[PDB]
Design a protein around this ligand. Structure first.
Ligand SMILES: CCCCCCCCCCCCCCCCC[C@@H](O)O[C@H](CO[C@H](O)CCCCCCCCCCCCCCC)COP(=O)(O)OCC[N+](C)(C)C
Ligand SMILES: CCCCCCCC/C=C/CCCCCCCC(=O)OC[C@H](COP(=O)(O)OCCN)OC(=O)CCCCCCC/C=C/CCCCCCCC
Ligand SMILES: CCCCCCCC/C=C\CCCCCCCC(=O)OC[C@H](COP(=O)(O)OCCN)OC(=O)CCCCCCC/C=C\CCCCCCCC
Ligand SMILES: CCCCCCCCCCCCCCCCCC(=O)OC[C@H](COP(=O)(O)OCCN)OC(=O)CCCCCCCCCCCCCCCCC
Ligand SMILES: NC(=O)C1=CN([C@@H]2O[C@H](COP(=O)(O)OP(=O)(O)OC[C@H]3O[C@@H](n4cnc5c(N)ncnc54)[C@H](OP(=O)(O)O)[C@@H]3O)[C@@H](O)[C@H]2O)C=CC1
Ligand code: SF4
Ligand code: SF4
Ligand code: SF4
Ligand SMILES: [Zn+2]
Lengths: 114, 208, 96, 341, 62, 144, 176, 156
């Protein structure tokens, strides 16, 4: 069944847009670190950008990829224009969340979580 | 006299029916259905890609001068294939009337932006996107308007929990406001209020 | 009719009293515990019994529209008093 | 376990952790960090305070409704100590002044008060006692601070045999003394150092790591009556450490050697202040003293905490001391200090 | 009009956390009629609800 | 005429019972008006009315210098008024409690308590419900 | 109908032109505004002397909550949970069980005053006039906990303000 | 003791000035800010008690949080509270500031400003009356009257 495309037609142009967004985010990390006076390193910011990109690597639908890159562009323009504060940039890192146990024995000890 | 019952306006009902037939005949390519509610409110259901032609006609036509966009919202009905329902309310000052145009869309289907017809459509479509995830193709500046910066998910969808997933507090260790998973001291108490006896026989659906 | 628990903490009309080993009694240190001294059960027991020479009596709680919804008590069971349950008021047919 | 002490939830702000902890000296640096961690866990925290209640305002948002209780306390009143440790199964002791006041001495704040707390807590039936001491706690130490620390450690161990005695090396953080004291010598021209800081070795420890180690000691059941040494992952000379501090602060570093007697006289001069002294003779001795090495005692790696290096969290503390010219300079612009390992 | 040979999956777009995406089993069912009443107007639409999780007692006010 | 105004001021000075009372009411009430005494409650508060003033200033209360066990010479609260005089002062009725005493009930507080927040007598919340689940108690006798 | 708020043109006769020139050179309207403010200065201030004088109120005013009793001393509440069902903010928590004498009475009746919106729906839905919103409004506290009322606190408020609450209900019960 | 008497008089003098000169920051969020206007209005004039609104947080002693605190607004409130110089006091006004109020179970509302800033006085209502807010302000003044910083320091 044919569906109306948002962008990119097939997957190749979607990957091209993903790479363009990745370049834009990669060239913005030093400026974000300098302006926001973050205590993190530039390497940490680049690694976090890489991690955020990688958690959607299993998407095989061009429209979903287009929406993902649209939202990425939105959250990048929020960072460039300093609409976000240091609060949100550090929210990307979950610095205050306690490490959730992942093994069966620890999950059994702590509570009733699956 | 029946003081406890609202009076009815058959004249306005007939006028709205005639104008609905008029617009349906003028625009057969996009108009799918026309209805008139018993409280005299005309309603037109069109194809999603007919938004620009239908709105342009309803704005510029001599007999339909709907120069004002009253409101623009979305309705979420998860049981439908095209869950999102885009609703436009138009006001004609020349003829002192109101009309409603309804179209449908899903998560991955863009809707043509009507900013070229009505200027209020800019912020109305920004709010619709922010609250439902409906994307508008040719929007001059599409971004979040009401939600917090970096907020994930669209709150007004029916599948979004009432309290969300995250909450904010001040953490003294990091000397900044932090976002943590939501946790309520008292859980919201859900009430089942629907009576098991049918109230309005006029709206009874076939058993099927 | 307030009563004191063995831990020195007063007991409310609902029977609430923190156990000896319960840590939650720390909230009452350097402060007090909010206990209402007037016991509704004791007062309503102190109320007397009204005698009426009719099988069915009506109670509205007194005051009319300022009371409770009007109810009818059937005074046929001679082994007990008929109690209006909105206000806990006992009525009884004149025996003997 | 009492039915009200069974843990519930997912370790959130509104959860139940089953820990009822009385934190003595919570109106301080390590105290505020420990109270923050406890409130984040969702534990019941009792905060005995002797100061103005206004000075305890920063502790209010650290816990949920009713999870923080503030009670007055004397230190010389065993009645008040019992009142505040009556219903708590954990007692944490962090009371201590780096100087001496008219009413309290190093003997009172490090021997008498910890001994009274340990003795009264044992009578009250407190399950766990954590006592904070110094890493360089030697009875024959030149510093009365460290002598009193060692004597009080022995007294606490005698009174409460199942105690956990923690010996941090030198805690650095936003509100600390160490980095702030070293970076506040800009006003006094150059930086006076004993033997130019070439004969002193220190390994400071991070405040968050110390607080997490204190928290984990409570939760770990096999650390009841033990002794721990909390130290950083790297050891630095005093000269190199101060040079790195000034480089991060982007301040002109002008070290100069000052003889020990002259430094002692200078420290004696500054301790005449009725208010908080800027420096004291005991502080000078502690700065000059090299941090002891205790490989036999366990540590943060044994408690499950990876020690945070200074190079990662130095800019959090020393950015405040920079000028507008260097406020926005990044963390990587300064080369890491020279270690002695 | 492109053609996609894929199954619809908007999990990455809904914004739900991975825990509540993976570890959740909903129950699709028609609600049972309440035995206390003879009405049958609540047994006509299908319902979707999630599995019950832990509820504890607040230390304050219970 | 300024003379009449000055004479009214002197009357206000002498209407409070000399210079000392005038100064007391000036420093602890910031107003030196004179009005008829409607009544006095059991705690020492006095209530005055002056219908010539505009609505709002026509009724007022001079608080007592000591209520319950707190010295309120300077620390006067708006919650120190008993409920009947509270109604009269807030103008929910035109009838003072002296003219129209409230209905007497055996459960009504005899001594009114002000806002006790920040004091040891402050309200502390707690659950009024019993324990929902009773846990099993193991036998005290040995086995085997 | 309609009217024009500003569509008047000034006359161009010599007298009017000279008057406008005098108004421009000599600040006539500015002096007029000064005179208005001077008149207000010489008027009487409209400030009441709180806390010795209180603002007007009505019997319908809704403030602090209270639980009432029957004249016999028995509590009016019958644990019917209508107030809990109708509360817009879900600020009422009720738990009930049969009393020792078999009466239908509450064991837990909590109101969160930091969650309540003071809308008065609970006293409309009460069929026995048990829960009321009393006239007291000066009950600010220093801690968040003190605003979480329970059944004992509400009964104490009822016993404290029973006279005024009864008087207000007597005054305003014929409009309901 | 002579020193004890001197410090008692000194910290009575200091507390009097701060009690009698309160400068709230001009900060209103929602409908509760209208009642602040009515308190500043002639009927319940706050200027009598030495309470004067100032725009800048640097020149403010009291922060009156009167309105719904949202997730998008909380960083700004914390920032202005931090920029207020000590001593600084906080008065939360209305249900939204105290707890959650009508929007307690909302994805975009902070359930109480005490999760962000240390609150000194809580004023209940929706909205609290002007008299209720004035009573809260006077209660804050009485709370300041009992502070003994110099008396704590002398025995420190
Ligand atoms: C300005 C340039 C620098 C000047 C330096 C200081 C100069 C001297 C300052 C003089 C201060 C005068 C204070 C007068 C007391 C206030 C009046 C009185 O009412 O205070 C009462 C008592 O106040 C306190 O108890 C103590 C007040 C200060 C005690 C005096 C301390 C020593 C002053 C002299 C030392 C100055 C030399 C040392 C510093 C330079 C409390 O009143 P309050 O309840 O609130 O009122 C509420 C409103 N009501 C009445 C309607 C309810
Ligand atoms: C010493 C104490 C003095 C006290 C005086 C105070 C007066 C009351 C103060 C209230 C007003 C104060 C706030 C208002 C400030 C602004 C007022 C103002 O702007 O006035 C200037 C006003 C505004 O101009 P526009 O409206 O913009 O029109 C321009 C059209 N293109 O214009 C002016 O410049 C008028 C200035 C007045 C000058 C005096 C008049 C001169 C007449 C000369 C006659 C005498 C000739 C001398 C020769 C004599 C030969 C025999
Ligand atoms: C020469 C100019 C004199 C410098 C004037 C000092 C002005 C104030 C500077 C200052 O206060 O620094 C003291 C500072 C702490 O004060 P704060 O900055 O307020 O810290 C914040 C506390 N919450 O004290 C320190 O930490 C450094 C003390 C080290 C002792 C230095 C002694 C050496 C000076 C004499 C050398 C003699 C050589 C011969
Ligand atoms: C006739 C002979 C003369 C008689 C009068 C003699 C004295 C006159 C006043 C002289 C100046 C003040 C002298 C010192 C006053 C006490 C200051 C002090 O030590 O305050 C201690 C304390 C600081 O905090 P602390 O408890 O130490 O804890 C540390 C962190 N919490 O607490 C504080 O710091 C509290 C905060 C305020 C401290 C400063 C104000 C003290 C009182 C000053 C009154 C005069 C003010 C004049 C101002 C200039 C003119 C307008
Ligand atoms: N900071 C460091 O570099 C290191 C410190 N330690 C030790 O750890 C402990 C905590 O350190 P730290 O947070 O830096 O110290 P702080 O000086 O910052 O805090 C001390 C705490 O104890 C209280 N206190 C002090 N003296 C007394 C007294 N006489 N009576 C009652 N309470 C008193 C203080 O309250 P108040 O303000 O009311 O007086 C405050 O809450 C101390 O024992 C210290 O020796 C160990 C290793 C390193
Ligand atoms: S006044 Fe309204 S919001 Fe408050 S408890 Fe009553 S019903 Fe609930
Ligand atoms: S509506 Fe009245 S009787 Fe019913 S539960 Fe509420 S307070 Fe009790
Ligand atoms: S408490 Fe009520 S009046 Fe105040 S801001 Fe919230 S909704 Fe508005
Ligand atoms: Zn009855």
């Amino acid at each position: 069944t044919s569906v109306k495309p948002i962008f990119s037609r097939d997957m190749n142009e979607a990957k091209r847009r993903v790479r363009e967004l990745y370049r834009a985010w990669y060239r913005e990390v030093p400026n974000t670190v300098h302006l926001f006076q973050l205590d993190i390193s530039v390497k940490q910011g680049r690694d976090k950008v890489r991690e955020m990109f990688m958690k959607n690597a299993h998407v095989t639908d061009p429209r979903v990829v287009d929406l993902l890159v649209i939202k990425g562009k939105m959250e990048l323009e929020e960072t460039i224009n300093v609409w976000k504060q240091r609060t949100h940039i550090m929210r990307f890192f979950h610095e205050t969340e306690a490490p959730r146990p992942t093994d069966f024995l620890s999950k059994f000890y702590v509570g009733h979580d699956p | 006299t029946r003081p406890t019952i609202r009076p009815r306006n058959d004249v306005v009902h007939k006028q709205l029916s005639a104008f609905g037939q008029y617009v349906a005949e003028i625009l057969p390519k996009y108009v799918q259905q026309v209805q008139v509610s018993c409280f005299n409110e005309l309603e037109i259901f069109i194809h999603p890609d007919g938004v620009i032609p239908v709105l342009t006609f309803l704005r510029d036509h001599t007999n339909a001068q709907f120069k004002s966009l009253a409101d623009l919202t979305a309705v979420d009905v998860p049981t439908r294939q095209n869950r999102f329902e885009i609703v436009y309310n138009l006001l004609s000052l020349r003829f002192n009337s109101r009309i409603r145009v309804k179209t449908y869309t899903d998560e991955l289907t863009p809707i043509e932006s009507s900013v070229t017809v009505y200027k209020a459509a800019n912020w109305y479509e920004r709010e619709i996107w922010d609250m439902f995830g409906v994307f508008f193709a040719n929007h001059p500046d599409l971004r979040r308007i009401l939600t917090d910066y970096g907020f994930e998910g669209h709150p007004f969808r029916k599948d979004f929990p009432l309290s969300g997933y995250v909450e904010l507090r001040y953490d003294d260790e990091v000397k900044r406001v932090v976002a943590e998973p939501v946790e309520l001291a008292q859980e919201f108490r859900k009430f089942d209020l629907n009576s098991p006896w049918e109230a309005f026989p006029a709206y009874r659906q076939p058993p099927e | 009719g307030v009563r004191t628990s063995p831990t020195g903490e007063k007991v409310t009309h609902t029977g609430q009293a923190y156990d000896d080993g319960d840590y939650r009694r720390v909230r009452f240190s350097d402060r007090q515990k909010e206990v209402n001294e007037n016991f509704a059960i004791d007062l309503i027991a102190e109320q007397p019994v009204s005698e009426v020479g009719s099988r069915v009596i009506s109670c509205d709680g007194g005051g009319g529209a300022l009371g409770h919804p009007r109810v009818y008590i059937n005074l046929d069971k001679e082994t007990k008093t008929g109690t209006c349950g909105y206000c806990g008021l006992q009525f009884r047919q004149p025996h003997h | 376990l009492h039915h009200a002490l069974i843990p519930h939830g997912k370790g959130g702000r509104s959860s139940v952790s089953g820990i009822v902890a009385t934190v003595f000296g919570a109106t301080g640096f390590l105290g505020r960090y420990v109270v923050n961690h406890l409130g984040r866990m969702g534990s019941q925290v009792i905060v005995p305070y002797r100061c103005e209640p206004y000075d305890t305002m920063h502790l209010r948002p650290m816990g949920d409704l009713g999870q923080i209780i503030f009670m007055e306390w004397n230190g010389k009143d065993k009645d008040s100590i019992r009142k505040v440790v009556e219903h708590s199964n954990v007692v944490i002791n962090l009371v201590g002044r780096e100087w001496e006041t008219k009413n309290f001495d190093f003997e009172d704040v490090f021997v008498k008060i910890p001994h009274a707390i340990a003795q009264v807590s044992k009578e009250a039936g407190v399950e766990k006692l954590i006592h904070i001491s110094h890493l360089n706690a030697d009875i024959k130490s030149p510093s009365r601070y460290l002598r009193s620390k060692a004597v009080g450690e022995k007294e606490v161990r005698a009174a409460f045999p199942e105690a956990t005695i923690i010996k941090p090396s030198d805690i650095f953080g936003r509100e600390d003394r160490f980095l702030n004291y070293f970076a506040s010598m800009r006003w006094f021209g150059g930086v006076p150092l004993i033997s130019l800081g070439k004969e002193t070795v220190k390994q400071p420890v991070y405040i968050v790591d110390v607080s997490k180690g204190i928290i984990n000691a409570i939760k770990d059941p096999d650390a009841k009556g033990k002794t721990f040494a909390f130290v950083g992952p790297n050891r630095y000379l005093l000269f190199d450490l101060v040079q790195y501090i000034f480089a991060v602060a982007y301040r002109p570093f002008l070290p100069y050697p000052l003889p020990h007697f002259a430094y002692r006289w200078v420290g004696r001069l500054f301790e005449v202040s009725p208010f908080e002294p800027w420096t004291t003779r005991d502080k000078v001795e502690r700065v000059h003293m090299s941090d002891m090495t205790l490989p036999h005692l366990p540590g943060l790696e044994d408690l499950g905490i990876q020690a945070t290096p200074l190079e990662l969290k130095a800019i959090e503390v020393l950015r405040r001391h920079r000028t507008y010219r260097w406020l926005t300079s990044e963390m990587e612009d300064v080369k890491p200090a020279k270690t002695v390992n | 009009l492109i053609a996609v040979d894929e199954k619809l999956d908007i999990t990455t777009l809904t914004g739900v956390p991975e825990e509540h995406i993976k570890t959740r089993k909903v129950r699709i069912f028609v609600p049972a009629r309440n035995n206390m009443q003879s009405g049958v107007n609540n047994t006509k639409k299908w319902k979707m609800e999630f599995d019950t999780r832990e509820r504890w007692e607040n230390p304050l006010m219970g | 005429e300024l003379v009449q105004v000055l004479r009214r001021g002197l009357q206000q000075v002498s209407g409070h019972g000399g210079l000392r009372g005038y100064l007391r009411v000036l420093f602890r009430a910031n107003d030196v008006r004179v009005g008829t005494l409607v009544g006095e409650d059991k705690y020492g508060n006095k209530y005055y009315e002056d219908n010539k003033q505009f609505f709002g200033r026509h009724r007022w209360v001079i608080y007592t210098t000591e209520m319950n066990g707190r010295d309120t010479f300077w620390d006067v609260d708006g919650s120190m008024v008993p409920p009947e005089w509270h109604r009269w002062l807030h103008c929910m009725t035109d009838d003072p409690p002296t003219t129209k005493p409230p209905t007497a009930r055996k459960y009504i507080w005899t001594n009114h308590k002000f806002n006790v927040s920040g004091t040891p007598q402050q309200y502390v919340p707690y659950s009024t419900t019993r324990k929902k689940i009773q846990e099993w108690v193991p036998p005290s006798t040995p086995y085997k | 109908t309609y009217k024009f708020v500003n569509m008047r043109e000034p006359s161009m006769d010599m007298k009017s032109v000279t008057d406008r020139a005098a108004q421009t050179l000599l600040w006539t309207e500015l002096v007029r505004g000064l005179g208005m403010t001077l008149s207000y200065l010489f008027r009487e201030p409209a400030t009441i002397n709180y806390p010795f004088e209180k603002g007007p109120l009505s019997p319908r005013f809704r403030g602090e909550h209270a639980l009432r009793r029957y004249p016999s001393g028995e509590e009016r509440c019958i644990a019917c949970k209508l107030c809990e069902a109708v509360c817009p903010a879900q600020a009422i928590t009720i738990e009930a069980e049969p009393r020792a004498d078999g009466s239908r009475r509450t064991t837990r009746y909590d109101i969160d005053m930091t969650k309540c919106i003071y809308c008065g729906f609970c006293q409309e839905a009460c069929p026995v006039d048990a829960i009321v919103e009393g006239p007291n409004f000066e009950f600010s506290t220093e801690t968040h906990e003190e605003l979480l009322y329970n059944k004992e606190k509400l009964l104490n408020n009822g016993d404290k303000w029973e006279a005024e609450i009864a008087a207000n209900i007597q005054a305003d019960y014929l409009y309901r | 003791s002579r020193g004890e008497y001197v410090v008692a008089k000194l910290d009575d003098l200091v507390n009097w000035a701060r009690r009698s000169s309160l400068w709230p920051m001009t900060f209103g969020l929602a409908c509760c800010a209208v009642e602040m206007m009515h308190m500043a209005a002639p009927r319940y004039d706050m200027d009598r008690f030495g309470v004067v609104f100032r725009a800048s947080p640097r020149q403010s002693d009291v922060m009156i949080v009167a309105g719904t605190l949202t997730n998008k607004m909380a960083p700004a409130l914390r920032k202005v509270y931090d920029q207020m110089p000590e001593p600084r006091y906080v008065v939360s006004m209305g249900s939204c500031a105290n707890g959650g109020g009508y929007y307690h179970y909302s994805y975009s509302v902070v359930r109480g400003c005490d999760r962000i800033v240390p609150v000194d006085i809580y004023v209940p209502g929706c909205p609290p009356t002007a008299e209720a807010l004035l009573y809260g302000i006077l209660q804050l003044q009485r709370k300041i009257k009992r502070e003994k910083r110099l008396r704590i320091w002398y025995r420190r």
